[PDB]
Design a protein around this ligand. Structure first.
Ligand SMILES: Nc1nc2c([nH]c(=O)n2[C@H]2C[C@H](O)[C@@H](COP(=O)(O)OP(=O)(O)OP(=O)(O)O)O2)c(=O)[nH]1
Ligand code: NA
Ligand code: NA
Ligand code: NA
Length: 153
């Protein structure tokens, strides 16, 4: 089994809207996140990436899922720990890396999101917790995947 590298993903989910960021360099909407760094907890890494990529600070996050990504031709898995929050207290800021944008929850931009999001995003919206795995060929093609609702992440 391949080694895996730790990542975070943060979704700011309010009652009628969700905050996504457009990757400027890419072209897809996503939550905010990145690699966990040495010596920080996964949750603290998620808080740090949220602040670095969107400008938003939150004191706490709720872990809602975990997704492992495998890419054909790449030696490592990406182990993505997915967090939510409903409570923010500043404005999102656009950088040269991510442009934040709010979407109403009847306008989730799936056509411009990664293909796996179509499977697990609906569980997140239902307040369900999940474990997923997706094997991609390139950016567009899923060759294999698993997804399961769990009571504990
Ligand atoms: N919704 C969704 N999110 C994904 C998928 N694959 C995937 O890596 N992510 C998330 C997890 C990561 O936090 C982020 C990709 O990490 P990144 O490449 O932006 O990491 P980074 O910013 O630290 O790297 P760098 O370019 O700044 O050096 O996107 C996916 O298929 N769907
Ligand atoms: Na980042
Ligand atoms: Na990132
Ligand atoms: Na899509």
């Amino acid at each position: 089994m391949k080694a895996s590298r730790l990542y975070t993903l943060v979704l700011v989910l309010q009652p009628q809207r969700v905050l996504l960021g457009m990757k400027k360099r890419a072209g897809r909407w996503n939550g905010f996140g990145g690699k966990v760094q040495e010596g920080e907890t996964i949750e603290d890494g998620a808080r740090r990436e949220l602040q670095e990529e969107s400008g938003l600070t939150v004191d706490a996050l709720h872990k809602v899922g975990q997704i492992v990504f495998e890419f054909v031709g790449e030696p490592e898995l990406m182990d993505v720990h997915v967090f939510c929050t409903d409570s923010i207290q500043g404005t999102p800021v656009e950088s040269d890396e991510m442009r934040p944008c709010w979407f109403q929850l009847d306008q989730i931009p799936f056509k411009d999101m990664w293909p796996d999001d179509s499977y697990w995003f609906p569980l997140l919206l239902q307040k369900k917790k999940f474990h997923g795995y997706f094997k991609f060929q390139g950016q567009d093609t899923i060759l294999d995947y698993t997804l399961r609702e769990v009571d504990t992440v």
